[model samples]
Target: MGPGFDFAQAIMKKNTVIARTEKGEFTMLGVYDRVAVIPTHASVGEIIYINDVETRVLDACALRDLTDTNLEITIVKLDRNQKFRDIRHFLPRCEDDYNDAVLSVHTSKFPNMYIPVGQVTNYGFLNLGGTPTHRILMYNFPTRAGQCGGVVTTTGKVIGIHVGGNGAQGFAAMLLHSYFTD
Candidate 1:
């Protein structure tokens, strides 16, 4: 689920989750249609689409960096075979703290969002990893009227979802790449 960003280049290599159109656009294809979230619940969040944007991918290192910012993310199995069912809420209508109410689910075993495209698991919350170095949580921000997820990372590799705000971007629950892969 590379979101709606410029995934054409990333998907050029066949056999991966994403695929490209003959005309150069990107499509989710089969994976998107087959997967879904386990626990369906009504949310105050609205669905929104992110405008596709292509960034420069210099090399493997640079590509990883760009992948962090531009591409859509889905939590996958350790073998990368299965996608989580709760990743469907990746895209939502623009929302900010002032415009919408914050919603939370009591369950931690499953995720709240699901990726309809590519059957990717775009999870909502990232655990703090118990490091306490910079424990953060996910928060909703307004790109216009929808709530979008963001991550904060000193190194482009790690990101924490911001959960609070005192005039700043709030905090994030640090997540690991291994978490999805595993």
Candidate 2:
């Protein structure tokens, strides 16, 4: 459902991915061809399973999804699939995703496009508004099926990653400059 966070050159398709974490399935912002980003609030511990393939939380910033900045995110390596390991070869500070779900997770491997719907309404910090929600940039869009990690692009330039919305009171996405350096 979004992105206007980059402010970079025009980037089309292959801009998002459906990543599953301890929290749930979220549409992640495609940082690289093989990397994605999700709001840190989407998980606990230090790992995330992209497409259910075990991966590490490469890096993160100190942010609370409901407080400071929703841009608070964690990175994961979306590597080539297939894996098998024994308990004896386990490692600490790492995670596992063992299951017998008959079907394998689908990558839905393809390019996803982005369209800049409209403008940013309220900068989350300025006003609490009338609802009980996170303090982040509120954009005017209808998000029926998407989240913040989706790349945001202006008419032709990247703006930020569009997170998602609260039922229907617009959506959330912010300037992504801080997440990368902090």
Candidate 3:
């Protein structure tokens, strides 16, 4: 968790994603924009952690418990390079639930959002006391949650995380550049 890396960049490096793995999947879960919503489904799994150290799949009842907790994330693509696919934000489903969890993934679907940061051939961030922002090769907007921490250019680079809003005098969304780590 240095000032240089982000959750999305780390995910692009992930090649072993599966339903269930012995090592398990580590995630920094969050919801998409709170606009569109989908009804709860039984096939959906709830957030469960093993010993609270690792995340694991919970039972069906746990899924039901997530009714008011899960955030109906907005699915978006990182870039056209087809590098990172099916990225979405999970907005908490209910007011009581603070921990974002309860999203399902499918290989066939590529839910993606547009990153206004433009083609990020390569990018990084620096801790300048505030949010670590991106130094990009192109467009820069006040990155949105669905944009940052996703993909940037078609070169298959993971974009930064959407951490801030458009400046009061502009239409840009503030974006924090993303890096990679374990």
Which structure among the candidates has the greatest TM-score?
A: 2
lDDT of 2 by residue, 103-137 (tens): 01112442243344455554544222343334355
TM-score against native, each model: 0.24, 0.53, 0.25
lDDT of candidate 3 over 1-182, digit per residue (tens): 22123343334334212221232322222212211111111122433232133333322221111224321122221111223232332111111211111111212122322222322222223222243333322233443222222322222222222222343111111122210101
1 or 3, greater by lDDT: 3
What ranges in model 1 sit over 4 Å off?
1-148
So what's the TM-score on candidate 1?
A: 0.24
> In candidate 1, where is summed lDDT lowest over 10 consecutive residues?
36-45
Ranking by lDDT: 2, 3, 1
lDDT of 1 at 39: 9
lDDT of 1 by residue, 40-145 (tens): 0111112211113222211111111222431222221121233333322222322212211122111122123221111112333333223122223333332110
Candidate achieving higher TM-score, 1 or 2: 2
Candidates ranked, most accurate by TM-score first: 2, 3, 1
The ten-residue window of minimal lDDT in model 3 covers 97-106
State each model's CA lDDT, in order: 0.23, 0.43, 0.24
